[PDB]
Design a protein around this ligand. Structure first.
Ligand SMILES: N=C1N[C@H]2[C@H](CS[C@H]2CCCCC(=O)O)N1
Length: 330
């Protein structure tokens, strides 16, 4: 089997991407944030505290003939940005882009934090990291991908995120028309439950490539590119007037600037992030200070290749017995 679904930016800045997912019988379609940095499939639901729902589409298990309470199971998750959610669990049929999993754990939110409530466009998350991070207790549950894997033509999924445009998540096949040149594969460590890999270095603009190992995670659920302070300082030093602002919460730059590109290494290959991808616009409406898309990972504890980086590439998440990650230009 295979699946193929379009993923669409939630706003004009590509802050996140939503992908329609069919849950239950008859289908209830919810727009979920596919997140390779976490491992829970959770949704706004008929059980979500009413005051914490503001425009989201909800899953109502009582209207699904295939829903079953997973008795005794609860879940609770906190993300790197401080947001959180929690609730109980149903199993139901879940389909993505024509690919169907029966008996998928669908985690029903009883509570969500303010940032979820305030984002009317995201109806929940679909985790695509390793199932060892799944938060369901007392019986940990498998991700959609892990459940689907045996049925897939090939045990892979791919992320092809657009810049200010829709893109695609495919399951079970590699679309050889979706990228240019060749795909370069690189080793993955699953020790922390993430798609964790080591970049071979970076360049700023037309500058020389610096060979240096940068361990980090391929994370579709994070907007920005978070890298060591040394790397980030070198980038922003090439932008007149750029500075790190503790009050704003990272690097800002004059909106009048033209940003340089940023290149990261994948083995001997190079992925170039155009400068415009690094512009996240005015810090507040009407401001001439703009927020940068490359930020320091100091204090996060891990480097994160978020959407800013991933949308510059066609990315293969290879879930074979020994997982690997592939990157191609496009
Ligand atoms: N600023 C927000 N944070 C949460 C809501 C909707 S997106 C969500 C954060 C998802 C993080 C995923 C992850 O860190 O792996 N708004």
């Amino acid at each position: 089997s295979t699946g193929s679904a379009t993923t669409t930016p939630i706003d004009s800045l590509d802050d996140a991407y939503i992908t329609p997912v069919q849950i239950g019988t008859p289908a209830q379609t919810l727009n979920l944030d596919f997140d390779t940095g976490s491992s829970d499939l959770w949704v706004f639901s008929s059980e979500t505290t009413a005051s914490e729902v503001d425009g989201q589409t909800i899953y109502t298990p009582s209207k699904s003939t295939t829903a079953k309470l997973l008795s005794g199971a609860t879940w609770s998750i906190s993300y790197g940005d401080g947001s959180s959610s929690s609730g109980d669990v149903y199993t139901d049929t879940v389909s993505v882009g024509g690919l169907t999993v029966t008996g998928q754990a669908v985690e029903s939110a009883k509570k969500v934090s303010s940032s979820f409530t305030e984002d009317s466009t995201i109806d929940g998350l679909l985790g695509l990291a390793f199932s060892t991070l799944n938060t369901v207790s007392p019986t940990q549950q498998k991700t959609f991908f892990d459940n689907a894997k045996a049925s897939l033509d090939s045990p892979v999924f791919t992320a092809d995120l657009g810049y200010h445009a829709p893109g695609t998540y495919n399951f079970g096949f590699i679309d050889t028309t979706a990228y240019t040149g060749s795909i370069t594969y690189t080793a993955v460590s699953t020790k922390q439950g993430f798609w964790e890999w080591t970049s071979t270095g970076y360049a700023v603009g037309s500058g020389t490539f610096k060979s240096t190992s940068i361990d980090g995670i391929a994370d579709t659920g994070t907007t920005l590119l978070y890298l060591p302070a040394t790397v980030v300082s070198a980038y922003w030093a090439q932008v007149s007037g750029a500075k790190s602002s503790s009050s704003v919460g990272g690097y800002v730059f004059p909106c009048s600037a033209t940003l340089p590109s940023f290149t990261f290494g994948v083995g001997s290959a190079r992925i170039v992030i155009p400068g415009d991808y690094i512009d996240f616009g005015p810090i507040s409406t009407g401001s001439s200070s703009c927020f940068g898309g490359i930020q320091s990972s100091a204090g996060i504890g891990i480097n994160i290749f978020g959407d800013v980086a991933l949308k510059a590439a066609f990315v293969v998440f290879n879930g074979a017995t020994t997982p690997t990650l592939g990157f191609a230009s496009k």
